[model samples]
Target: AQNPNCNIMIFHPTKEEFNDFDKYIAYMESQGAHRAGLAKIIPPKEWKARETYDNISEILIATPLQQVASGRAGVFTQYHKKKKAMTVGEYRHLANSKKYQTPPHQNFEDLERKYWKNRIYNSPIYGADISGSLFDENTKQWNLGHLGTIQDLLEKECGVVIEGVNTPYLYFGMWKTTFAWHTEDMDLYSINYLHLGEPKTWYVVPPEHGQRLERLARELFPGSSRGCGAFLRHKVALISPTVLKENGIPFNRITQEAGEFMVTFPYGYHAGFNHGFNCAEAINFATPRWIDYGKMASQCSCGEARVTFSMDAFVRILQPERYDLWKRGQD
Candidate 1:
């Protein structure tokens, strides 16, 4: 017999299975889903959410889409090297306009007026506070505010909204807009939900081959290391799946669409671009299982830093006995 599905796994979980998120993830892993370091989840049909880009108007956003036609593009991938700043209200008009519909390749020949085609992404709409959105009755599983069992317990331990970590952020995107290649801030688990619009394609290189990706990244972005222990966090460098495989890193490609949830595991080293206009929300989360790697990230990179909450504080709240031993080691 031969093997075929080495790509990231996909799961369709029932409301019960979803609410039991840890067990559900474990269930996915049991069938060999963990090999790719991440999984794509489709909630039940009714798990659909009710919100779109229309909900954003007053929010200020910057267009950081790629400005270069070639690989020599700089650290930031935005609309212009100069950057265009506007409210989401103004952009909604531009993004949907006839001029926005066609993004030219190489040169600007097909245009009656000036406009932008590069995606407007990562406008940070503070996920917890966003309104006019509703998840289907039994589908809190994909809601970052109302996460599955284990992440909820981890949040409860924090006792305070840890902003970017516990609080979700909204990202708006259009054709070819991208997120940089990097793992979650502290090797924590991250879940992204596409609130509306077209699919976002993601690429992942599993943790076992994590070092190979890093070695290649260092060779590729040799300039980014002066500021940090590792260059991955610079949010630079966009390599294709073929390029990654050419460098000997096993990679997976996932096209995540509307209402789908993408869970990125610790040390997964992933990145991707959007197919077209879209609104997606994402947040960092963890269960007890994430603790060890979270701690290891401290010994690994300062770039991981404090964006994630303290593992010590988390342990003290849920597993007080373990905290005592860890606390004694500090002194």
Candidate 2:
């Protein structure tokens, strides 16, 4: 509500932007940061993306993933995970050493084709559980201090049980590793921190115009309600910025650098690709404001059921307090 451009806002917080923790929270709240959109916060201090994974070769090699043998690259509901030419550890070694090519040419179509080939042979690793000691010094700084992590804050203050649904997912990406267009699950907000890596290009269609874009997708591609015609195996169809403007849909473009935090608000449709090799961590969270959207997202249809908040449980827990506040005219 505070900012006019809510769908995809870029905030460059100077070192003196907010005086303290309270101010940080106040600033975010004032900006309606809890609303549905995407924001990229570039803090003054550098958050080294390289350091996040450069020295983790030994750690990754030691930790084995069950799906690695199955040739599946973690859990991606949208597309099929093809066999990797190299093991996850081997791919990590290549990424760490910066030994991969950046695809000879540019332009979305050819690069996507090359990326699909890379995906078949050496898909990027997704959703590695890196909680606790696994987080490095710099990595820990990504989520430091105040500005409540909505998921954690909800659990502490509202007694919400957000375990698997809002867990952190670690990503080890190389050239062409792409996340297709979709909103946060249950319309819950998400924060993505790039610890270290080449820049990642993001294309965002704000929440206000999300449905229009989805309608365009269904009309053009047919049968795809999630927007973006990239679901066809090995094919990625992203709407250009010009096309978005032509359709009267508001959109934003940003290249996320290392140490920056990308916040996607509830229902903001976004998709992006890693420039080369990179390391990133992403997690979902929600505020009380997100309850209605969360419930609706749970009932939305798609190829697979998206993860959703248990509204019944939350309502049961929150009803008494809500009524008490209403009794005091605080509703």
Candidate 3:
């Protein structure tokens, strides 16, 4: 398969621009803002890569969708107190029971309600109860407006020069948890940051990985029966800032830091590994051209989809202005 080329841009933030949030917003607003989709830009890389990602004004923040909790641990703790530990089967059965179902959502909630004062380990979710502060983050994703003062500073100091018509956004996603690595709409790029907790390992590999991972993912976390976004022509390499070695595989990890870096796909595969999941911050741009609706719709057929899941979709969709050859035939 032939790899497609893409256009790249860059940005530079002045000291004042980086510090003054309000000035940043006004300056960028005058430049023509755009919506962001999905992309992660670490702090260390931001300065250098800002130029390329400047065009990406909007981003989608992936929030913690599920209330995390340790199923086995909860049951064990309860057993010690009551001297009545149920088997795994029994635990699962009880968990599925209507009593548990009637809840404020997850199993952890029920455990908290039932165990209450006797509850051990802080709270009933995961290994430890999530800090109330972290969970309190609103469920909805935040665009630039939500950034408050920071948004103003970034626009003025960052020198983003947003020319597109979309609002910049930020997506707060799980740390180590995978987003199934999908492509974003056009006119978008991302700047991700790791605020607190551990760092995630990102995977940057070849086109072949797309096919291989899709098949494996189907079994691991299949999409709706309707079909999975498993197979597609992948290009954007999944690169982690954390250093990773080749395990007889086509991928490697890059250690994350603040600042921006050029992520030219058709280059390799990149992905993140076991980092504390809840602590990752991915700021991205939502470009209208980032998503290829026609391509997205063609993915339902089952058999392996396109192997080059990179700029293939984007080129065909966004810059038709550029010259290239793409075939959308039988799967």
Q: How do the predictions measure up, each by TM-score?
A: 0.70, 0.65, 0.33
lDDT of each: 0.59, 0.54, 0.30
**Which ten-residue region of model 3 has the weakest summed lDDT?**
124-133
TM-score of 3: 0.33
User: Which candidate ranks first by TM-score, i.e. highest?
Assistant: 1
Q: What is the alpha-carbon lDDT for the whole of candidate 3?
A: 0.30
Report the Cα lDDT for residue 161, model 3.
32
TM-score of predicted model 1? 0.70
What's each prediction's clash count? 4, 5, 92
Candidate 3: tens digits of C-alpha lDDT, residues 136-184: 1232222222334322322454443322232332222222223324433
Candidate 1 clash total?
4
What are the per-residue Cα lDDT tens digits for candidate 2 across 44-77?
A: 6643333434455443422322122112222122
lDDT of 1 by residue, 115-158 (tens): 21223323211112122223444445656666643345556654
Better of 2 and 3 by lDDT: 2
Model 3 residue runs over 4 Å out of place are: 1-64, 67-178, 185-189, 195-197, 207-209, 215-249, 257-274, 277-331
- Runs with alpha carbons beyond 4 Å of true place in candidate 1: 1-6, 51-70, 73-85, 97-139, 148-165, 298-331
